[PDB]
TrEMBL record:
<feature type="binding site">
    <location>
        <position position="126"/>
    </location>
    <ligand>
        <name>S-adenosyl-L-methionine</name>
    </ligand>
</feature>
<feature type="binding site">
    <location>
        <position position="697"/>
    </location>
    <ligand>
        <name>Zn(2+) 2</name>
    </ligand>
</feature>
<comment type="function">
    <text>Regulates the ATPase activity of the NS3 helicase activity. NS4A allows NS3 helicase to conserve energy during unwinding. Plays a role in the inhibition of the host innate immune response. Interacts with host MAVS and thereby prevents the interaction between RIGI and MAVS. In turn, IFN-beta production is impaired. Interacts with host AUP1 which mediates induction of lipophagy in host cells and facilitates production of virus progeny particles.</text>
</comment>
<comment type="subunit">
    <text>Homodimer; in the endoplasmic reticulum and Golgi. Interacts with protein prM. Interacts with non-structural protein 1.</text>
</comment>
<feature type="binding site">
    <location>
        <position position="99"/>
    </location>
    <ligand>
        <name>S-adenosyl-L-methionine</name>
    </ligand>
</feature>
<feature type="binding site">
    <location>
        <position position="51"/>
    </location>
    <ligand>
        <name>S-adenosyl-L-methionine</name>
    </ligand>
</feature>
<feature type="binding site">
    <location>
        <position position="82"/>
    </location>
    <ligand>
        <name>S-adenosyl-L-methionine</name>
    </ligand>
</feature>
<comment type="subunit">
    <text>Forms heterodimers with envelope protein E in the endoplasmic reticulum and Golgi.</text>
</comment>
<feature type="binding site">
    <location>
        <position position="426"/>
    </location>
    <ligand>
        <name>Zn(2+) 1</name>
    </ligand>
</feature>
<comment type="function">
    <text>Component of the viral RNA replication complex that functions in virion assembly and antagonizes the host immune response.</text>
</comment>
<feature type="binding site">
    <location>
        <position position="422"/>
    </location>
    <ligand>
        <name>Zn(2+) 1</name>
    </ligand>
</feature>
<feature type="binding site">
    <location>
        <position position="431"/>
    </location>
    <ligand>
        <name>Zn(2+) 1</name>
    </ligand>
</feature>
<protein>
    <recommendedName>
        <fullName>Genome polyprotein</fullName>
    </recommendedName>
</protein>
<feature type="binding site">
    <location>
        <position position="816"/>
    </location>
    <ligand>
        <name>Zn(2+) 2</name>
    </ligand>
</feature>
<feature type="binding site">
    <location>
        <position position="100"/>
    </location>
    <ligand>
        <name>S-adenosyl-L-methionine</name>
    </ligand>
</feature>
<feature type="domain" description="MRNA cap 0-1 NS5-type MT">
    <location>
        <begin position="1"/>
        <end position="258"/>
    </location>
</feature>
<feature type="binding site">
    <location>
        <position position="127"/>
    </location>
    <ligand>
        <name>S-adenosyl-L-methionine</name>
    </ligand>
</feature>
Length: 852
RNA sequence: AGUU
């Protein structure tokens, strides 16, 4: 008789328009298309997925249900979501899209996303009038819905009969609009006997459609899976309404794809021993997956592993309810949906890490060489490089700036025996166990590899090589409270505007030549030190072996991959080396801006050195003082504004700017208070004394958003509060000028016990000196930071009350996201005594004293 | 189904 899909249909068509509206998305997975749909309106052709379809297809490609390869044919491509996504897949060489177009139908949208040069979409091409072509991958998403099941039925069969002749021992993913009608089930079964595969439900599909997808890589009972969907959809009628799960939309990159230029060539004599050891520490589940996704990293093998990560983050209770208005604001409640699930990370690797930078021109390479040799010499004018020791490393661990096996390990004499063993390999130019991650005690191998880095390259951070005194451009050991002052001093330097261009994924943009230039520091080292440093550079920085997780349809596996260039982001002195190359890169760009370095010079194979040496030796230091370089973050105030147009060398060096077309001139500021740097801008405040403060500031919502997050007590109240009181005291020392934050700060500290220890990292930022931890009176701590220890505060007159500590002007406070003025803020302002009384009751009966 |  009647099928469960048909019962579902009849009941779907009986819902009210508002009962259907809720059912349509109850418990489904959706994609955030807001950013993409406004990029499309602004006519942007990069990064954006052209429709919801790219994310839909991704779900299948993720689980290898279909693995597009060779020539891909996309029947009914529409705007081209599936076609644009396939263009960036490893084994894909060509994509052809056929769609009907015309009135009432989707026309393909031209894009410049990565691999556009192998995509060919055509309108005026009805596939039901089209002779089948040879292809290695057949996609089809055609399915015109209907409130009549039997109408949907014949439409589905029409699609099926159309599409069958395209199938011939090739990959395929085909939408089956209505799969529960008996005759379709019948036809699918005959199809499954001939071409194999299986029907699968996509979680991104709305509950208002029964659509399933016939994919080639799978086997299973058709009737069973269809009826499972039927029950699920039928269940979601009566289940209490669930707000859909929201994913982050796909990033399809930009630029042409040269498939032959992607594959990595591994130095097996360098990385072989490391692989071998991984292989036999996990020999029981070790295998080689030919279906690995890596385009530009060299794959070596895999072993099985239990899954790690979450799609969302644990919210802090104490703050969440002391900040009731922000329960509703989107920007705050969104930084929880960061996803570190195997899927989430494999997505990140594809779009951000699995890329390859073209080798810079010979002229560009010479410039970087000359500049680096000079820069290194400048950085070592007073200091010598030095080795760091076990004693030094151990002390740094015990001052744990919970990684707690860290303090156990260094005390283990057995741990250091392994370290010694590995060091003797490095002296012979070999590496056995230096592998890092992206996320039986293999833990020792990893704390040991970090130490050896620290031993050889730790001096850069510990001896403050990139402090402002030593590097002019640098800002190491300064802190948020000092950064804004440095920007204000820079603005006093005559010239062009202040430019702050962010590189897109800096660490992935580090090149072979960058690595070879940072390496030059070893020339200043003692022999025994150079030996160890040369081992670090050559064997582990220029030959990286990485463990990375990957979800598969039969479990999670750990992939072992390798890469010669790029930067290992989890390495010692990543900050310093980033700062160095960025300093060099910005000097290079200043030369081009000043006309010293021309297009002819970058292309010219033998660039005469005399010109660049002269510029550096006469102007270099002055130009370094025009900059503030913190790792990959820079602020540059050149001698004029030609710099904004100086783009040849910067792009050729691989340091492509973020969120701007590759050849569009940079836009800078002349108001230094609007310059972004280290995730902040900096306001100048006038105390009613008359003296001036330069405070750090940022969008208030991302300050509040971070503080509604634990790290990570599940579920400990007498520890989740101590994280909140840490934020609350940071807000007091650093963001006192914000009205909501300072008020919220007084609402937290009065709600949390007086001498309860504040722990856990607030932010692990290099410029966060964390001097807000002591359970000391905040005004006295504030006074030491902003008055007596402040070099830019001449009059050391102390502050006796919190009303001599200024705010931002209401206008400027509001512009930075403050909710003052909104009456919900007012109701919140007079309800925080209760909210305070709430958590104090939620904690218990202990030492409170009021900051109300 | 995609588009709002
Ligand atoms: O397949 P979609 O997710 O994209 O959903 P839709 O809107 O095209 O139509 C699918 C089925 O859902 C039913 N439908 C459509 N509308 C606008 C309504 C309904 N059902 C009810 N009770 N009220 C509606 O307004 C149709 O059966 C349609 O085939
Ligand atoms: N007979 C036909 N021949 C070619 N294309 C057709 C067709 N009938 C419908 N189509 C197109 O097929 C599309 C199905 S929706 C496909 C969207 C696509 N998967 C994406 O990710 O963007 C519709 O846009 C429709 O215009
Ligand atoms: Mg910046
Ligand atoms: Mg629809
Ligand atoms: Zn090693
Ligand atoms: Zn601000």
């Amino acid at each position: 008789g009647e099928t469960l899909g048909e019962k579902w249909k009849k009941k779907l068509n009986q819902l009210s328009r508002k009962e259907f509206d809720l059912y349509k998305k109850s418990g489904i997975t959706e994609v955030d298309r807001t950013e993409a749909k406004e990029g499309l309106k602004r006519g942007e052709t990069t990064h954006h997925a052209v429709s919801r379809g790219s994310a839909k297809l991704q779900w299948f490609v993720e689980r290898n249900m279909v693995i597009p390869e060779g020539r891909v044919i996309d029947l009914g491509c529409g705007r081209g979501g599936w076609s644009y996504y396939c263009a960036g897949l490893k084994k894909v060489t060509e994509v052809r899209g056929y769609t009907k177009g015309g009135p009432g139908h989707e026309e393909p949208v031209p894009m410049s996303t990565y691999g556009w040069n192998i995509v060919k979409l055509m309108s005026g091409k009805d596939v039901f009038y089209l002779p089948p072509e040879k292809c290695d991958t057949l996609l089809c998403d055609i399915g015109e819905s209907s409130p009549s099941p039997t109408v949907e039925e014949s439409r589905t069969i029409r699609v099926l009969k159309m599409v069958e002749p395209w199938l011939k021992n090739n990959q395929f993913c085909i939408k089956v609009l209505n799969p529960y009608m008996p005759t379709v089930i019948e036809h699918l079964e005959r199809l499954q006997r001939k071409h194999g595969g299986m029907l699968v439900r996509n979680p991104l599909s709305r509950n208002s459609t029964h659509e399933m997808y016939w994919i080639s890589n799978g086997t299973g009972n058709i009737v069973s899976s269809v009826n499972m969907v039927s029950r699920l959809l039928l269940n979601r009628f009566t289940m209490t309404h669930r707000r859909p799960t929201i994913e982050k939309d796909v990033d399809l990159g930009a630029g042409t794809r040269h498939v032959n230029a992607e594959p990595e060539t591994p130095n097996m004599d360098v990385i072989g021993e490391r692989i071998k050891r991984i292989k036999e520490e996990h020999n029981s589940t070790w295998h080689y997956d030919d279906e690995n996704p890596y385009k530009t990293w060299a794959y070596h093998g895999s072993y099985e592993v239990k899954a790690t990560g979450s799609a969302s983050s644990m919210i802090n209770g104490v703050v969440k309810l002391l900040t009731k208005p922000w329960d509703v604001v989107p920007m705050v409640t969104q930084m929880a949906m960061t996803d570190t699930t195997p899927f989430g990370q494999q997505r990140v690797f594809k779009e951000k890490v699995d890329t390859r930078t073209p080798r810079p021109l010979p002229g560009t390479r010479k410039v970087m060489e000359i500049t680096a040799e000079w820069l290194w010499r400048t950085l070592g004018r007073n200091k010598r490089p030095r080795l760091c020791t076990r004693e030094e490393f151990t002390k740094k661990v015990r001052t744990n700036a919970q990684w707690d096996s860290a303090k156990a390990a260094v005390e283990d004499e057995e741990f250091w025996k392994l370290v010694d063993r590995e060091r003797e390999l490095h002296k012979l130019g070999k590496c056995g166990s230096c592998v890092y991650n992206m996320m039986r005690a293999i833990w020792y191998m990893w704390l040991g590899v970090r130490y050896l880095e620290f031993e050889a390259l730790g001096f850069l951070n510990e001896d403050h090589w990139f402090s402002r005194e030593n590097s002019y451009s640098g800002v190491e050991g300064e802190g948020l409270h000092k950064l804004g002052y440095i920007l204000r001093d820079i603005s006093k330097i005559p010239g062009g505007a202040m430019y702050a261009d962010d590189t897109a994924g800096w660490d992935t943009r580090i090149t072979e030549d960058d690595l070879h230039n940072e390496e030059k520091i070893i020339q200043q080292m003692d022999p025994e030190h150079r030996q160890l440093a040369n081992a670090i550079f050559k064997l582990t920085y220029q030959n990286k072996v990485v463990k990375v997780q990957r979800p598969t349809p039969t479990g999670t596996v750990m992939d072992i991959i390798s890469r010669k260039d790029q930067r290992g982001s989890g390495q010692v002195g990543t900050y310093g080396l980033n700062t160095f190359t960025n300093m060099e890169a910005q000097l290079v760009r200043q030369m081009e801006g000043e006309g010293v370095l021309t297009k002819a010079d970058l292309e010219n194979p033998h660039l005469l050195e005399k010109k660049i040496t002269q510029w550096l030796e006469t102007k270099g230091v002055e130009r370094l003082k025009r900059m503030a370089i913190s790792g990959d973050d820079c602020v540059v105030k050149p001698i004029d504004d030609r710099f904004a147009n100086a783009l040849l060398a910067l792009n050729d060096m691989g340091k492509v700017r973020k969120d701007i077309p590759q050849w569009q001139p940079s836009k800078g500021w002349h108001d230094w208070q609007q310059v972004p740097f280290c995730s902040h801008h900096f306001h100048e405040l006038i105390m009613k004394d008359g003296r001036k403060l330069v405070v750090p500031c940022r969008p208030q919502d991302e300050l509040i958003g971070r503080a509604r997050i634990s790290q990570g007590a599940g579920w400990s109240i007498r520890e989740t509060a101590c994280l909140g009181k840490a934020y609350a005291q940071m807000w007091s020392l650093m963001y006192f000028h914000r009205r909501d934050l300072r008020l919220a700060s007084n609402a937290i500290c009065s709600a949390v016990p007086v001498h309860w220890v504040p722990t856990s990292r607030t932010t692990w930022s290099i410029h966060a000196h964390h001097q807000w931890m002591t359970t000391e009176d905040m005004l006295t701590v504030w006074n030491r930071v902003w008055i007596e220890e402040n070099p830019w505060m001449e009059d050391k007159t102390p502050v006796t009350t919190w009303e001599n500590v200024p705010y931002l002007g209401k206008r400027e406070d509001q512009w930075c996201g403050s909710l003052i003025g909104l009456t919900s803020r007012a109701t919140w302002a007079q309800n925080i005594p209760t909210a305070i009384q709430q958590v104090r009751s939620l904690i218990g009966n202990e030492e409170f004293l009021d900051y109300m």
